[PDB]
Design a protein around this ligand. Structure first.
Ligand SMILES: CCCCn1cc[n+](CC(O)(P(=O)(O)O)P(=O)(O)O)c1
Ligand SMILES: CCCCn1cc[n+](CC(O)(P(=O)(O)O)P(=O)(O)O)c1
Ligand SMILES: CCCCn1cc[n+](CC(O)(P(=O)(O)O)P(=O)(O)O)c1
Ligand SMILES: CCCCn1cc[n+](CC(O)(P(=O)(O)O)P(=O)(O)O)c1
Ligand SMILES: [Mg+2]
Ligand SMILES: [Mg+2]
Ligand SMILES: [Mg+2]
Ligand SMILES: [Mg+2]
Lengths: 379, 378, 378, 379
């Protein structure tokens, strides 16, 4: 389809006579039609109309029957109704039934058709919709910061009723951000999750999802009325959890390591700091399996979908390409952050390698699968 | 911040600042957070004493076992009955009144449970909204540059895996909405779906076949020959917003009737879409062109995936990042017919590109119109 | 634009608009540029006639062979002597006066030379500024976390290929300048070189050895043990601006003396530099911290290679794109000593980050100071 | 160097006794020093000071000579002068000359040295600078647009003297944008050129560098007083030339194709439109060899250094990755833009493949080499 215009059916390439308006200027007829002046029109359509007439006349005799002429006009985009068929057979003068191209072409060019009437619109849909009222997540701070009263609460504002409910950011904020109708490539896999930030980039004060309290707010880590802070240094990336997940203790991971009874941890390596309790969509890129006291303490490595570089980061191997030093720094921070308190370096499975996204994603599901049961056992 | 607080209501004055701070001339806050040391049992105590005084508003010198209770809950303690009775028993305050020293001494002797914390609040707002996320698909069929070429649309159930054919126009949603929206409440909603009919840098005409079933995208062929913009190539992705209809039974700015088509949008981003390709866009503005005496709106939107989409908030940021773009879109639409013996096209609002709010509103009425067109014909 | 113009001075009124335009109800401009046709010999003529009338200010009805000359040059013609005499001869206007018709007729008969256009104006401003672009290099030597580890700097002649060792501090330029600046005159110059001493996410101390020859970068080792920020890790690239010196023989805002070091800059971009790594930055602001009673400025700059550098114009755009950043830089500098039994550091201008202009000025005086320090010691 | 602190010289790994403060907490001494509290200090330095004393005492006897003690203190960063050497030998009580570590350490810890005096600063440079006055390029429009008077002129404003001169954008604007001292990787090759835009993105009006006129301004293409415009459509990318280049006719390229007597053409595929005559730095990515009337008419494919994606575009193969459709569109535009006027498709060498950057760059040099001679032959 780069030489000459065709029929759109099945034919040979050899015997079709190339528009005489093309051979003359030695330019294919495709180039002539698309990029030439409009003089390769009515006279140009003629030959493309003659070759298509030859394409329905397979028993190449020199004419079609009033039955073929019919679909061909359906083929060429024309809305042939009964009131226009008889008109056709009436106009077309062939008392024997046979119609020659010359006769057909002349008739065609003399009846663009009746565009009037009522221009029809097919309403055929598959009507697939949902009642679900999109909810707006809201986060309100209350209490005084760096004291046992400060909390971060979560709410849904019905974007239809405008009514508000308090939710658990752990149970009610979707782990998977899905789209009713996904328009991104079929070929490109789904990688969009919600991330709840607990410890903001560049800070060292401890906060956590209160798994004990109702609606699981975000509270600060406070022992005997004094707030707690990481002493090794500040968290240099947003650090929080992926909601709707649970590292169950009743379970064994990568050898003989039990979960830590916590929602899975995530580290957001983007350049933008989140506020305590802030939720945002992330892209999972890998996972670091650390052991926290014989417990399997993973760390999902994700990047905010809103980061300048998220698009160039496909898997865990590109992080060193665009964010050199990041992983080794992330590794090292976690490996040694307890030593300043008089503990010892933490250990890792997989020889501390940052396992890729597919590995990370499976881990996330299992974590999600366990949260699901915890929902039913406790209900 | 100066000194550890109780989180309640008091006077700044007489609070005696930890002696380990004054000594060092550092605030208590600085000390606690940035000092490499662990607040000694003796330093917690003073902080704990001051907490007890904040619960003792009537400054009596003790609390009633009911307050010691709230206070213990304040400080994070899981106080059940077997715990409450336990405390009341250890303290042995026959009159009900508990003094700090007695409290402290009890507390320092009972760091409580470790595993009984197995308790996990399950209270949720059980918003069970299951459904089957569908995956849009598109298959080419027929031969290109011929009356047979079509572009079909389907939904793949991302659960059952079953596939059904749909209409790009009636079935692909106009508003890309999230079951739970996590983007800030302050940031208004701006994510619509766009159906590319004619690709950036191309001039071959295509279109959502409103008359055919399922409305595939077919090519513009008249008398067996495909049609092409002769003026030049579209320089941006040109398509439509699904689920919208500019009705003819209606009049828009200037007493101009609609053109019986889904509304047109132009996508200014750098990446070229492929014929029939769908994607999420941000609506920026709108240009009112008069096509054959009818109202032919043109939404100006950018793909949410463009390196600059984020830096474009309304129609006035286009010339800051894409200078020459708006001018060029207008001029191309103002003269693309003259090369075929036609005249300059006219526009409403003196050819200025109205802002996104105005744009969105028009898209809405266009969506409402579509919706009605469904009722009438069903 | 309405109708083809002469590029000179006339009245809009009586100009008779090409008949081929009026016919079509399209401007002449629209027609000429967007009409697919070639302006017929007959259409050029009217345009050419109107040009001749614009040279005929005294509206006489002819021009003198000296004007026909300029006019021919206006219209792009290369009119030399063998050409001038040729024209005067063809026209044969014995009295010197040439009428349009005669002119046109001559013109249409002499499209002139084709290859004689071999003439190429070579007139330049011969600004022959040859030199040897050097390529900075850096070689590690010695063992890391020991008194031997150094980082040396060299220039590779990008012509002769010869390599000489240099001082990162005296030889790497402070201002990255272009022999010929092509960035708009309106956009002021903001490109300085930065020498990373301590990498983003690291806490091991390094420093440009001002006392040693060539000033390599050496590690901070006291009594055989390397030194480390105990407070936390630097969270941004921390280094210095070469060719600057905060002199002690000077007093800055608040009667604070300099600290006898090259000025410090912090690089807020996402990418971590490697120890001793140099790069171009954009200066955004400046933070006056008092270090040991001396003035310890800290330039806030971003690598010119950061995805957001372009969207950061002054110190107030930092919180829009890197929210929490300025706050955090200040707090880290305000307390990094307390963890070692020290006190909060103080700042000038009430700890606000002054803007780039203020910053640049300080860097200048710092550059001037350095320059003087070269004279005194040489 | 991840276990324990070393001497920085040459020794064995086995016999060195690991700090007793380390074995106790089972944390390497490297982790102890860097991430532990400061109690692993004076007592910690002691052993690292004892092992380094053992490193200078190669004939392991139990002491050094007043000559070794000397360089070691030079090694440990101390500025040992004569007035501090005698002090040393005077303090250190060893009338025999031999000095035991215990004696050395005790002396050390009792004399941090004389930081007073005059803190010295090495001024040793290689002083390599240039007199050249950075010039500011300026472009002034004059004349009336779409008439034979409009021109775009170029000027240099001395950024020292503030004096201004008129220049040729063809001869005087550097082809190579070089940096006096290049700080970008040695490993990463130089790819920075100046590009002069003649035809702005999204327009169809013709403009060109007047190779005939003095100072070679930018003028519009005007034949018989009417301006000329591409009739095939608008230029959809900024189209112009690379200054300081010349496709010589006295030369043959890729077979039997002669240059076109023009400064080499470049196509800027960035998302931002340049103004007529606007100059800017670009990154060369490839080259398309088109034949314009038997002449070798190249087209350099470059991207503005200021484009959001320039950094992710390394060579010609990534253009389809990030800017899909671009090259085929660029190819096609050029292949057929003359047909609307009644000409025929243009041909290409290399089977129309877009040759990579290294190929493109060599072509650019040759082009630059030819411009250079044209400078001398004509001078
Ligand atoms: C049973 C005694 C353990 C209580 N405890 C207090 C603080 N930490 C550290 C953590 O809580 P973990 O590393 O998750 O154990 P974090 O997440 O580092 O703040 C442990
Ligand atoms: C008489 C000359 C009209 C020829 N013709 C054929 C197709 N169109 C293009 C449109 O269908 P219309 O110009 O608006 O009707 P669209 O808005 O470009 O999709 C015009
Ligand atoms: C008495 C405790 C001081 C110990 N000490 C050793 C090194 N420094 C860090 C500095 O050298 P300084 O604190 O400014 O002199 P810099 O500004 O961080 O490079 C401090
Ligand atoms: C000798 C007769 C040729 C004169 N002529 C006028 C216009 N063109 C086209 C170009 O000038 P070319 O393709 O460079 O030859 P352009 O760069 O397409 O505008 C040719
Ligand atoms: Mg804890
Ligand atoms: Mg029409
Ligand atoms: Mg100090
Ligand atoms: Mg020409």
């Amino acid at each position: 389809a780069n030489s000459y215009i065709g029929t759109g059916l099945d034919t040979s390439l050899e015997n079709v006579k190339p528009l005489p308006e093309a051979c003359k200027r030695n330019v294919t007829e495709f180039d002539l039609v698309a990029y030439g002046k409009d003089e390769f029109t009515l006279s140009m359509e003629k030959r493309v109309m003659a070759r298509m007439f030859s394409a329905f006349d397979v028993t190449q005799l020199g004419y079609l029957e009033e039955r073929k002429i019919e679909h061909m006009c359906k083929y060429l985009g024309r809305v042939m109704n009964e009131d226009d068929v008889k008109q056709m057979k009436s106009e077309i003068n062939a008392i024997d039934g046979h119609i020659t191209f010359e006769k057909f072409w002349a008739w065609w060019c003399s009846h663009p058709e009746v565009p009037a009437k009522k221009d029809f619109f097919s309403m055929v849909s598959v009507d697939f919709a949902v009642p679900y009222h999109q909810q707006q997540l809201l986060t309100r701070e209350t209490g005084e910061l760096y004291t046992p009263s400060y909390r971060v609460l979560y709410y849904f504002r019905d974007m239809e009723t405008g009514k508000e409910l308090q939710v658990s950011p752990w149970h009610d904020i979707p782990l998977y951000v899905r789209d009713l109708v996904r328009t991104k490539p079929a070929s490109l896999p789904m990688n969009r999750y919600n991330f709840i930030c607990e410890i903001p980039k560049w800070t060292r004060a401890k906060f956590e999802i209160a798994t004990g309290e109702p609606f699981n707010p975000i509270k600060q880590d406070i022992k005997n009325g004094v707030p707690r802070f990481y002493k090794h240094g500040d968290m240099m990336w947003n650090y929080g959890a992926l909601p709707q997940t649970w590292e169950s203790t009743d379970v064994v991971f990568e050898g003989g390591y039990v979960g830590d009874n916590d929602p899975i941890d995530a580290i957001e390596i983007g350049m933008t700091q989140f506020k305590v309790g802030q939720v945002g969509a992330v892209k999972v890129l890998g996972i670091l399996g650390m052991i926290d006291d014989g417990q399997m303490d993973w760390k999902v490595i994700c990047i905010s979908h809103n980061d300048p570089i998220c698009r160039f980061l496909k898997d865990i191997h590109d992080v060193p390409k665009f964010l050199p030093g990041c992983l080794d720094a992330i590794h090292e921070w976690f490996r040694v952050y307890k030593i300043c308190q008089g503990g010892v370096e933490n250990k890792f499975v997989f020889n501390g390698e940052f396992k890729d996204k597919s590995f990370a994603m499976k881990v996330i599901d299992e974590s999600h699968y366990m949260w699901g049961n915890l929902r039913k056992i406790n209900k």
